[PDB]
Amino acid sequence: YVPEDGLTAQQLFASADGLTYNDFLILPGFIDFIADEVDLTSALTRKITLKTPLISSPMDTVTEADMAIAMALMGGIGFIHHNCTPEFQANEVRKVKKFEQGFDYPLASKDSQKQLLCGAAVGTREDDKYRLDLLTQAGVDVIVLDSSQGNSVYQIAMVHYIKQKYPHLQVIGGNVVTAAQAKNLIDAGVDGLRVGMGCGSICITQEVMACGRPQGTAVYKVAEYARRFGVPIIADGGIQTVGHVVKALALGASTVMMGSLLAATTEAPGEYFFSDGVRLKKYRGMGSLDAMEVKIAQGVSGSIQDKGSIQKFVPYLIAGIQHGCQDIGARSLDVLRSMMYSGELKFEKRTMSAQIEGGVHGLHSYT
Amino acid sequence: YVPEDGLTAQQLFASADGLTYNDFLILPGFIDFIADEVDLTSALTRKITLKTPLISSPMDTVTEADMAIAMALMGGIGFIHHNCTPEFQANEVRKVKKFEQGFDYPLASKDSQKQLLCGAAVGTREDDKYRLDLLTQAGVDVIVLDSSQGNSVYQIAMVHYIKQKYPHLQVIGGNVVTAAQAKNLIDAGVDGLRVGMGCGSICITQEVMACGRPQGTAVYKVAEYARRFGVPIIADGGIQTVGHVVKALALGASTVMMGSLLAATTEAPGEYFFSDGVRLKKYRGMGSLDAMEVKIAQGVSGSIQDKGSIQKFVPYLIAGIQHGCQDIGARSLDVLRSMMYSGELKFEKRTMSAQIEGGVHGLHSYT
Amino acid sequence: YVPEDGLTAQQLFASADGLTYNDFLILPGFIDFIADEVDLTSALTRKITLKTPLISSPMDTVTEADMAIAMALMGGIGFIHHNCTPEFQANEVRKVKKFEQGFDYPLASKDSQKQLLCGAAVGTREDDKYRLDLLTQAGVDVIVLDSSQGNSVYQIAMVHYIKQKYPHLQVIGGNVVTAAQAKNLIDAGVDGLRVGMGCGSICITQEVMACGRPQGTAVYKVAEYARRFGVPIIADGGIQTVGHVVKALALGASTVMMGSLLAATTEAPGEYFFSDGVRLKKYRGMGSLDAMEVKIAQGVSGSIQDKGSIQKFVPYLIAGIQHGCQDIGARSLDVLRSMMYSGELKFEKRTMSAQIEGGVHGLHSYT
Amino acid sequence: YVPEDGLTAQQLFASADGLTYNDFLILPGFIDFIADEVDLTSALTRKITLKTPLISSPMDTVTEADMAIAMALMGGIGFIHHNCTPEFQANEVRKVKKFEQGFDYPLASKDSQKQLLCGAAVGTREDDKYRLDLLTQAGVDVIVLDSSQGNSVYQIAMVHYIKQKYPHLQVIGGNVVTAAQAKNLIDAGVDGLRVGMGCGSICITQEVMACGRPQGTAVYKVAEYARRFGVPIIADGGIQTVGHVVKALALGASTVMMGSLLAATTEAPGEYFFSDGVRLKKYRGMGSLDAMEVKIAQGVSGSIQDKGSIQKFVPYLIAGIQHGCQDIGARSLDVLRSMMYSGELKFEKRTMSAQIEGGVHGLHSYT
Ligand SMILES: NC(=O)c1ccc[n+]([C@@H]2O[C@H](COP(=O)([O-])OP(=O)(O)OC[C@H]3O[C@@H](n4cnc5c(N)ncnc54)[C@H](O)[C@@H]3O)[C@@H](O)[C@H]2O)c1
Ligand SMILES: NC(=O)c1ccc[n+]([C@@H]2O[C@H](COP(=O)([O-])OP(=O)(O)OC[C@H]3O[C@@H](n4cnc5c(N)ncnc54)[C@H](O)[C@@H]3O)[C@@H](O)[C@H]2O)c1
Ligand SMILES: NC(=O)c1ccc[n+]([C@@H]2O[C@H](COP(=O)([O-])OP(=O)(O)OC[C@H]3O[C@@H](n4cnc5c(N)ncnc54)[C@H](O)[C@@H]3O)[C@@H](O)[C@H]2O)c1
Ligand SMILES: NC(=O)c1ccc[n+]([C@@H]2O[C@H](COP(=O)([O-])OP(=O)(O)OC[C@H]3O[C@@H](n4cnc5c(N)ncnc54)[C@H](O)[C@@H]3O)[C@@H](O)[C@H]2O)c1
Ligand SMILES: O=c1[nH]cnc2c1ncn2[C@@H]1O[C@H](COP(=O)(O)O)[C@@H](O)[C@H]1O
Ligand SMILES: O=c1[nH]cnc2c1ncn2[C@@H]1O[C@H](COP(=O)(O)O)[C@@H](O)[C@H]1O
Ligand SMILES: O=c1[nH]cnc2c1ncn2[C@@H]1O[C@H](COP(=O)(O)O)[C@@H](O)[C@H]1O
Ligand SMILES: O=c1[nH]cnc2c1ncn2[C@@H]1O[C@H](COP(=O)(O)O)[C@@H](O)[C@H]1O
């Protein structure tokens, strides 16, 4: 007999401290398989499944056609940003949809016609209807309603309109952090939910508006509620490391969306420049004054260091996730989440001293 | 009559905050002996006892033959690293085993033939069997199975193989942080356990894989479980100070293993170099890309400032431990641990403000 | 009717978090007197009362005869350090005892013969008996047994010896942080207690030996126990501000001892020097290698910025204490402590965010 | 070393469950004296001390002159009831004051003239002033203001009047169960307090008026507050056993007042009668309709079984108290209370199952 060690997820979130990724760890389990055996199949919506849980964010410094093609080939997907004209966006979607490899990718995301999957973002205003018919003529597969606070009559009306006019189109609902928000969007009829508010690397929404939630708590609560109706959720924002990806998936998320991790890659839109002897690319929030152009800024504009190509960077992330799952003792992401919900998966909190101990420390210097 | 002050260890760990060394202190007791009377005899395995609780880590920038000889003479032991050919490792072990002082050390670690004790690390792959054969012909005394997560079918199979083929060899099992992990390795038949995951100074395992545990909690829990079967545990990683050594021993550990504290000594492998006007030596994790050579890095590579010789540095550590035990009121490490388990030893938590108050503060400058 | 706000001291310390001065505040009360009316009379020992609660520390960079004379004139007292020959120490005490003002100070500390009060420190070894003989012929008024851990057979034996040979001499017992330590020294027969271990500005005892206690908790617990026997306690170490003085007095201390606050004044021993364009004086712990001269260092050696004269600095401290007492609504320190013990005085905890809010913030620059 | 067992009184009352005598026990201590050595000296008021803690209640079926003489001879005291004419009451007091033994009692309660001590009860109306002067002419020693709720302007005015006109007379203030009630009466100037409301054996005040407090909690809280001003308190009502007496004294009471325990003794007023083959005496509350004669009844009227003489019954109670103190390890009642306040005395709660286990159980029959 062995006494139990650590906390279940339900106990971990019972004290209501406002935890996020860096505040806890996952305890190791039992290893009886190799890391290359770990299955990463994940549900994007009610009806779309991917071989990898990685999604590119619809930001104008992250995802255009080249990014989307690379993500689809690597086994994820990309959502084209809509900070542009509808004709431009539809042309980007068409470029993705008509790509042909030579004119090996065993994990590529494909539709029935064997074309690459693609997604796009739209707003909740009247002209977005015209945007929408253009995008559907270009052959989009899935739509995300792009908003900081999706629990509104505007977004609900847009969801109803889409469901009426295109009964085949998959729709992902706007950003939520509570079950009460999730309920209205699920009743309106969304096939997926985007979770997170204020946690993004370029975000200042929390400081400016006082509204948001710690991302780990938000992911756990919303996923726990949404699984009751078979609705998968995307964990969006605040991902800085492979460990963060693993933690988000273990807390209930089906997929993970990244802006800053994938910025400054070759496929990202924009030009490379130099400063202080380092190669850089621009990365900015959609709510920064540069992107929008009295108007209130909800994001900043900055730069990221070059990371190389997506087709090199993504396999590193996949291998990291598989090794994390092996250390946990889970041979697939479905098994990981079922162990979490049954209480078999165990967690531990970290003090600030523990977090310092977890990083590099006590060295004169290092690279 | 006096009311009780402070917390017992069991109460200290009851709230499950995820404590490590810097998060608490030990309250003083009653002094009726001098510091030079404090006995530091400690059990390395079921059948090997040392006169000092200090062990050198099997890393390729820490322990080769010179380090191992120095540690054995000072009253500890060293484990030769296996990031090298089996012939090279066996030659290192032979060099340690055939050393003769002149061809005083009252605390030296010796075997029956009166030769210095030595240890070595091996992996869990097929060629490690041949490594084992060579090391056993060189006369090793104890083996550590070297792994980040020892609770696996591979390590269990290797333990069974070693027990079958060399019934006399002492084996220390791979790194664990939970009682459930400890149970499988103890059932397989290990004579000792290495405890710690993610806490090392050169480690990034926690950030990359999301898996680990705060080291103080891990030491307390695993030692409390393992004492039931008479299995001693080594506290491995995260030791930066003599106070950390004392805390680890008071929490239940029998010995303490150090990588970075003993790096940049004369006996450490490698060459001294200069930079920015300071003499330095390389110190790197075994999971860094330099050591291993898609592959995922689990450690970094850095440098440490010169510390002088082991035969000067270790007596400083011994005297520090003895003075800590005197302030606690414990005349031996066995007495210290029995006071801990009986509840006589008392602890107190530290806020961050308390930790700041505990260090140097309020000075213009100091050296 | 008004509901109660805040915590009593007993509730504040019930959760056992390990609080220091910076972790809490005192809530304001009702003002019906001016700040100049606040009485600061305080008990140094069972039989010595001072008009001010301020004491100079027996360190070789803080208190010699000039410091002691200034402190006595301002209404406190100084303890001569014993890092010197007994003849030198006795000469210092004689210089203090024979001082005559002109060869106004309404608060000066005097004895029956109308000479200034003086104190001295001694150790617990055999030659300290001869030191004691010389100091008593020089006319000392009070002795502090100087040790990091006073709960020992050595200190108890020295207390018994002093009580037997000089039944008139007042003795203050070595540094303690628990009631169990306090009990033995009180049974041996001390007239006062020095409280604090590891909290001093130049101290590294906690990091090196793992032994100590947060100073606010230590003061509250030891004073609560010691008042039962009519033994006053000195709060020693970790005082950086007037607010810290006020907090220590409100938690139960009768007097406060300062090393670093009074260092780099004109009366402090040593010479002024310049570096980087600032005038400085040396300030070092008695356990640093410079002071002691294998030996283990328990303190560091540094420098402090010039503060001017004691006869200017101390009145600033007195006025600060009086204004704090006025804001609290206490017209004397005895009344302050009685309000604390009755539960009328109320406290509140501070998060780290609250502590940041409490300091200077949100400025481009300031002086 | 031994861990602490049980709860201190402060911890016992921290959960606010509303405990009374039967809800807890006292844990045994260490015996190093015989039961006959136990000192039972107790303070009745600021200025009257008795050799025994037992008081007779001022009820018209309990205390008249014969009861008062017997109690004084046995070492307690009796308060004459005032449900009668002032001339009758004064005659009773005169009878007590002029008694002479023969016209051995080593514990008898005496005044300076060597006459037996006596007490009397008065109300808070205008004619009570005339009652009071008559009683003072008869030579009363102490007065209790007799009321169910003493925290009123009427009782405060009567206390002021008594203090003005008879500065030598000791006054005990009306029944209270809270510190807020106690404060007003202490400010008015009482020398003692009567504690208890609704707990008496013949009382229905709680059922009729919804106002009261469990007696054990009331005794602890009021005594803890009143000791700060040197005011002793009487525990009044709800005493059925010697164990209850011991518990009340251990919780802080200085004396204990009994109505029903002393009813149906030879000295009690009234006539013996028979019914159903048992000898009985009447015992009724002062608030029952029979005693008062729309009027609301606050007590009932009943009967008690004959107990014999006071001079036999009281020594049994004294011996029981002494044996309880011996089992506790307290050689006097002052020592018992000091052990309680220091935390050395330890208590334990009882479930209902534990209370059943504590009585007689599992027998066919018994006598
Ligand atoms: N996830 C986050 O925390 C976060 C925070 C800030 C910004 N962002 C991103 O930046 C961009 C800005 O988002 P946003 O919320 O400011 O844009 P939005 O268009 O959703 O909201 C702007 C404002 O217009 C209002 N509005 C929207 N549709 C309306 C309609 N049909 N009729 C009337 N009023 C209407 C909204 O209620 C809101 O006050 C998006 O790409 C968003 O995803 C995200
Ligand atoms: N203590 C720590 O937290 C920590 C963390 C990282 C690395 N390290 C150290 O760095 C080095 C690297 O350790 P590691 O765990 O990466 O090495 P490892 O060889 O134990 O593990 C590497 C991978 O190979 C697999 N593997 C091992 N033996 C196998 C077998 N027989 N058949 C199939 N698969 C097998 C493992 O399951 C794992 O996925 C070691 O020296 C280790 O001690 C320590
Ligand atoms: N308050 C603090 O936290 C703190 C910490 C470190 C140093 N200090 C100060 O620095 C100085 C050094 O203090 P310390 O405790 O190192 O000095 P100490 O002389 O009290 O202790 C030194 C060592 O000698 C031992 N010792 C003392 N008297 C002895 C005797 N008669 N026989 C045998 N052994 C004996 C002690 O037990 C201890 O191991 C003092 O001035 C002290 O106040 C204070
Ligand atoms: N201890 C108990 O729980 C308890 C309960 C009920 C009765 N008793 C006893 O029974 C008897 C009845 O007590 P009681 O409280 O009913 O009697 P009381 O005379 O104290 O009170 C009767 C009523 O008269 C009022 N009153 C008293 N003095 C007054 C004044 N000067 N002017 C105006 N109003 C005035 C009171 O406020 C109350 O409403 C007493 O002997 C008492 O000790 C005790
Ligand atoms: O301007 C902005 N203000 C606040 N949040 C934004 C903004 N732009 C994008 N976001 C969110 O931040 C996410 C990316 O955050 P990151 O991965 O942490 O860089 C996006 O997917 C959006 O949900
Ligand atoms: O590359 C690595 N990644 C993570 N942990 C390592 C690595 N190499 C060694 N370790 C562990 O870290 C310990 C030393 O840590 P340190 O004493 O804190 O420097 C070793 O004994 C190993 O257990
Ligand atoms: O060398 C040392 N090591 C640790 N504590 C010391 C040392 N020297 C003095 N102290 C303590 O520190 C106090 C002064 O601390 P400060 O006021 O915070 O500067 C003294 O009164 C001593 O109790
Ligand atoms: O009529 C009444 N109603 C309520 N309480 C009474 C009454 N008469 C006396 N008491 C109280 O009950 C106490 C006696 O209670 P007993 O010892 O439990 O019988 C007296 O000392 C009074 O405080």
UniProtKB/Swiss-Prot annotation, chains A, B, C, D:
Subcellular location: Cytoplasm; Nucleus
Superkingdom in the source lineage: Eukaryota
Pfam family, any one: IMPDH
Regions crossing the membrane: none
Residues annotated as binding IMP: 201, 236-238, 259-260, 283-287, 298
EC annotation from Swiss-Prot or TrEMBL: 1.1.1.205
Matching SUPFAM superfamilies: Inosine monophosphate dehydrogenase (IMPDH)
List of residues binding K(+): 198, 200, 203, 357-359
Residues with Omega-N-methylarginine modification: 213, 227
Assembly notes: Homotetramer.
Stated family: Belongs to the IMPDH/GMPR family.
Protein name, entry field: Inosine-5'-monophosphate dehydrogenase 1
Origin species: Homo sapiens (Human)
Organismal lineage: Eukaryota, Metazoa, Chordata, Craniata, Vertebrata
